[PDB]
């Protein structure tokens, strides 16, 4: 699906615009969240932890749309139920 591609490229442009100022990782996480109307943005220490958390969330929440971008993970959902479940999983795992 090319729409997910265009969203990834939007996240890349947002990364550049964050690159222009001196931002913290959480500021860039908030920018990622607001850019693609995400529900949860988790910034891992490595790409491996990012993939692992994303796979756990996808197993527990199938309807979520996950974007792994460097060590950032972007969770986009269609309902508030999935948002709450994804938040609980990411916060407690």
């Amino acid at each position: 699906d090319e729409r997910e591609e265009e969203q990834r490229r939007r996240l890349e442009e947002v990364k550049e615009e964050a690159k222009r100022r001196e931002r913290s990782e959480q500021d860039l996480a908030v920018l990622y969240l607001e850019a693609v109307n995400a529900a949860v943005v988790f910034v891992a220490d490595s790409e491996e932890e990012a993939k692992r958390v994303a796979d756990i969330v996808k197993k527990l929440v199938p309807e979520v749309i996950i974007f792994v971008h460097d060590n950032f993970v972007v969770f986009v959902v269609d309902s508030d139920e999935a948002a709450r479940r994804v938040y609980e999983i990411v916060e407690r795992a």
């Binding site: 692992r52 958390v53 796979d55 756990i56 996808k58 197993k59 527990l60 999983i89 407690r92 795992a93």
Partner: protein
């Protein structure tokens, strides 16, 4: 070909033409009361049940003979006496008529300290320590065995049990009652192996046997003891005004228990209606036959329900064309008053034959104790089956459906040690269910000589209609479990359970974080189990129900769900209740949570290595259950 609606309508039709009260009244005749385990009248009722099973023309009627050790009263009378520490007077408080089976025979003298119910929280919130003193407790919240174990954990030397009037509004203050204090089930002198002659009965004692004397006393004796005690009992205990806390400095209590062991022969009566497609898989329906006194509510109701259900299902199969796919076993147990001894020893004797064959147990004991509430305790695999049953069975009095609370499943209490379904669920891994029409209070005459038919028919004038409703619930359970090609066992329910587990872990996150541990593997196992259940439901949906082979594979995978939650890392002889959800011991999830709870209290009660092993073994039990449910071994995905 009959479908679910036809079977429901014919079942209700036969329930309308059934007289339960007549059989209850027959079970309370003088030829059957009292029926202590192994007594002559117990054998008479066993023979009557056997002849009824034969007259119903079941597929096969048989029996099992066991030789078990119980405890009975000795010629020497147990006594509760008050001694003055000056030595000038001794006062016989009571020579009780009842007793507590499996109590240790000893004489102990010391202070008498009142504990509310004998629970651990009652003991912790106590002003006076109980070490070296005798404890007096009320019955009602936990089993006698749990009270005695909690007392022994704090080095108490004796336990007295009484029935206060607030919890037991009995006019007769001198009423005696009976119980047992074995922290377990089955014959306590054959722990983990059947009580058969083949074993030649080797010397082995269950670890749940208490080491202090415990005795039941009347309320009059309790008030006589309170007369020699000081301190008001707390208001939140909600007991009688005569209640007191600790004996005076000048008064001590002497408790003398001299009960003796007795080897008896018990009979388990069985009837079987064979299935028409898969007769090797079966449901078990059981009821306790023995009772200390008359046991109308404790034993008569359940036995009458068993007889009526067997008769009605035999008539439906022989005359109404009912063709159950799987078999149905009706069981009359004995020695249930001593801790479900008959059922537990039957399970231990035929575990190898029941493995992945018996897929549901339905207990009928104490199913009619009132009319206000309908209470159920079962494995989650049956929850859906209960819900659908509660949504079309009407209350015997109000006429409404039993399904009134949509959040009932989140308020279910797990099966307890005194319930006969507990060894089925926790030891043999068979989904079990117990249910009852009851009140918010306990039936006051259980274990007493006033548990007669008169008291039952007086407290419940609609006894016939309530018994009919209980029999309808049980019969709908049986029909749903045996009539179709699908088992109606809801594996997805366990997902909810797992969620609760990790949520219960959240309140200790900080502890988990400072020990260098993570909960990520548990969440991954939850994801694997949820996906496996989803894949199984999808496969059931896409399968052809007439294709017996695909249905056979999927149903075998269903029948392995409860078994895979039995802990594979513990000795079944020393820890028979292996179920990590509903068993007892350090291998269960509640035990893990209690051990983890001890880490906040910064004293050395927390055991870190034990907790690490508990977490590892529970994590892999859950993960292995998910892997086994996912399919073949090569189709398991690992990160």
């Amino acid at each position: 070909r009959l479908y679910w609606d036809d079977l429901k309508r014919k079942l209700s039709e036969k329930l309308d033409s059934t007289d339960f009260t007549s059989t209850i009244k027959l079970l309370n005749e003088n030829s059957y009361v009292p029926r202590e385990a192994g007594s002559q009248k117990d054998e008479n009722l066993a023979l009557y049940v056997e002849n009824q099973f034969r007259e119903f023309k079941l597929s096969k009627v048989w029996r099992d003979q066991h030789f078990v050790k119980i405890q009975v009263k000795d010629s020497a009378q147990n006594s509760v006496i008050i001694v003055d520490k000056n030595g000038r007077l001794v006062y016989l408080v009571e020579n009780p008529g009842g007793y507590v089976a499996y109590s240790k025979a000893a004489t102990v003298t010391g202070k008498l300290v009142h504990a509310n119910f004998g629970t651990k929280k009652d003991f912790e919130d106590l002003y006076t320590p109980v070490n070296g003193s005798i404890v007096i407790v009320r019955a009602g919240k936990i089993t006698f065995a749990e009270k005695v174990a909690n007392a022994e954990s704090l080095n108490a030397i004796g336990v007295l049990i009484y029935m206060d009037q607030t919890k037991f509004p009995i006019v007769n203050a001198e009423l005696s009652f009976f119980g047992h204090a074995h922290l377990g089930t089955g014959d306590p002198y054959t722990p983990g192996f059947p009580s058969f002659n083949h074993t030649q009965f080797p010397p082995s004692r269950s670890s749940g046997l208490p080491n202090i004397p415990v005795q039941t006393i009347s309320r009059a004796a309790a008030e006589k003891l309170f007369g020699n005690m000081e301190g008001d009992c707390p208001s939140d205990w909600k007991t009688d005004s005569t209640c007191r806390m600790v004996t005076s400095e000048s008064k001590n209590v002497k408790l003398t228990v001299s009960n003796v062991l007795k080897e008896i022969k018990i009979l388990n009566i069985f009837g079987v209606i064979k299935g028409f497609v898969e007769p090797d898989h079966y449901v078990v329906v059981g009821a306790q036959r023995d009772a200390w006194g008359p046991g109308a509510a404790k034993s008569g109701v359940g036995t009458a329900l068993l007889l009526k259900l067997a008769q009605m299902f035999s008539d439906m199969v022989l005359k109404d064309g009912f063709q159950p796919s799987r078999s149905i076993i009706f069981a009359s147990w004995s020695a249930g008053d001593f801790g479900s001894v008959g059922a537990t020893e039957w399970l231990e004797g035929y575990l190898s034959s029941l493995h992945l064959k018996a897929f549901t147990y339905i207990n009928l004991d104490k199913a009619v104790l009132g009319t206000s509430n309908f209470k159920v305790s079962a494995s989650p695999l049956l929850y859906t089956l209960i819900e659908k049953t509660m949504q079309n069975v009407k209350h015997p009095v109000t006429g409404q459906f039993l399904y009134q609370d949509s959040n009932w499943a989140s308020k279910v209490e797990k099966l307890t040690l005194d319930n006969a379904a507990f060894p089925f669920l926790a030891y043999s891994g068979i989904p079990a269910v117990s249910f009852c029409f009851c009140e918010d209070t306990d039936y006051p005459y259980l274990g007493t000589t006033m548990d007669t038919y008169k008291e039952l028919i007086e407290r419940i004038p609609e006894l016939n209609k309530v018994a009919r409703a209980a029999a309808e619930v049980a019969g709908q359970f049986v029909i749903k479990l045996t009539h179709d090609v699908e088992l109606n066992l809801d594996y997805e329910r366990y997902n909810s359970q797992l969620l609760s587990f990790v949520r219960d872990l959240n309140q200790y996150r900080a502890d988990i974080k400072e020990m260098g541990l993570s909960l990520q593997w548990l969440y991954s196992a939850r994801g694997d189990f949820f996906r496996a259940t989803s894949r199984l439901t999808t496969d059931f949906g896409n399968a052809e129900k007439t294709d017996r082979f695909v249905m056979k594979k999927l149903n075998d995978r269903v029948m392995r769900v409860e078994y895979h939650f039995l802990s594979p890392y513990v000795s079944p002889k020393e820890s028979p209740f292996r179920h990590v959800f509903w068993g007892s011991g350090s291998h269960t999830l509640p035990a893990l949570l209690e051990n983890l709870k001890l880490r906040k209290q910064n004293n050395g009660a927390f055991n870190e290595t034990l907790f690490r092993n508990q977490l590892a073994l529970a994590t892999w039990t859950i993960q292995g259950a998910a892997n086994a449910l996912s399919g073949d071994v090569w189709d398991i995905d690992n990160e």
